[PDB]
């Protein structure tokens, strides 16, 4: 945990990560064209700082592709009953992230020619967002599950910025290694062609001398 600080809420120190991988998702905006950009997902389970007896599920949608992007979703154990009654879920709180991960995996491994084909789409409405995994069969585009997303508190944004910064620093070290390799190889090519032209001119001069 880089740059840590305590505000009453979700205890990120006691968090348990369940899913953290890029997922291909269609992004839809009202004024923009629909583009298939591979967004990174994060699934977290844990307890609140106030009470460890209360369990909380947390979902983060980030975009390593763009420059800044983060949306958060919090589900309490109490709120899970409401969501389960609204969307007709049958599993318990514990298996909810497992089923979400199963649907996301079905979505990522989707091949272009498949019926039914699972897909994920995120619609951005200003600051808020609505994420739904859909099934496109021979008939219709039926939604499996629909979840609502909003922006995040300043703390989670801070830690996401720190993670992105660390990733970019690692890339920059790799880049310095690659530039050393490529410039040394280019210099080698130059010096070898130079030595070859010198030898060619010398042999031509010798040929002129003999003739």
């Amino acid at each position: 945990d880089g740059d840590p600080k305590a505000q009453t809420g979700f205890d990120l120190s006691t968090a348990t990560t369940l899913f953290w991988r890029p997922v291909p998702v269609h992004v839809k905006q009202q004024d923009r064209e629909d583009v298939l950009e591979e967004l990174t997902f994060r699934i977290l389970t844990g307890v609140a700082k106030q009470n460890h007896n209360l369990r909380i599920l947390r979902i983060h949608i980030s975009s390593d592709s763009d420059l800044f992007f983060l949306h958060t979703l919090e589900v309490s154990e109490e709120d899970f009953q409401s969501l389960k009654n609204d969307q007709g879920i049958l599993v318990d709180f514990a298996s909810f992230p497992g089923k979400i991960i199963s649907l996301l995996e079905k979505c990522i491994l989707a091949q272009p020619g498949d019926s039914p084909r699972f897909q994920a789409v995120l619609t951005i409405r200003g600051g808020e967002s609505v994420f739904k995994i859909v099934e496109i069969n021979d008939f219709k585009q039926l939604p499996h599950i629909t979840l609502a997303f909003r922006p995040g508190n300043d703390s989670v944004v801070k830690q996401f910025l720190a993670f992105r910064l660390s990733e970019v620093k690692g890339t920059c070290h790799d880049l310095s290694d690659d530039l050393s390799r490529t410039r040394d190889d280019r210099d080698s090519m130059v010096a070898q062609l130079a030595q070859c032209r010198q030898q060619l001119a010398q042999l031509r001069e010798q040929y002129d001398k003999h003739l």
């Binding site: 369940l18 899913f19 953290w20 991988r21 890029p22 991960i101 995996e105 990522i108 690692g170």
Partner: protein, 93 residues
């Protein structure tokens, strides 16, 4: 029908205080990797840090020079398996 474990774990780059490891990924879809580094058979608490599934490499820092450490990568693969199907190496700086 598949390993569901990591296959090739080797140290590509090494400095006296920190190490960088790289591993080939299992064929199954990997949710995330949990990298646990600890001192060999010593009373050092095992330290775990999480890396996304897309990563096949990782870096460990804060190591003591000249000490043989045990580095284990736990894979969170499909079928909800967690801290399971590990691959381990031992390396001294």
């Amino acid at each position: 029908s598949v390993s569901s474990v990591p296959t090739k774990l080797e140290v590509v780059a090494a400095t006296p205080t920190s190490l960088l490891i790289s591993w080939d990924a299992p064929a199954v879809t990997v949710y995330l990797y949990v990298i646990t580094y600890g001192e060999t058979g010593g009373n050092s608490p095992v330290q775990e840090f999480e890396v996304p599934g897309s990563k096949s490499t990782a870096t460990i820092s804060g190591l003591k020079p000249g000490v043989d450490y045990t580095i284990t990568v736990y894979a969170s693969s499909k079928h909800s398996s967690r801290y399971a199907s590990p691959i381990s190496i031992n390396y001294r700086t």
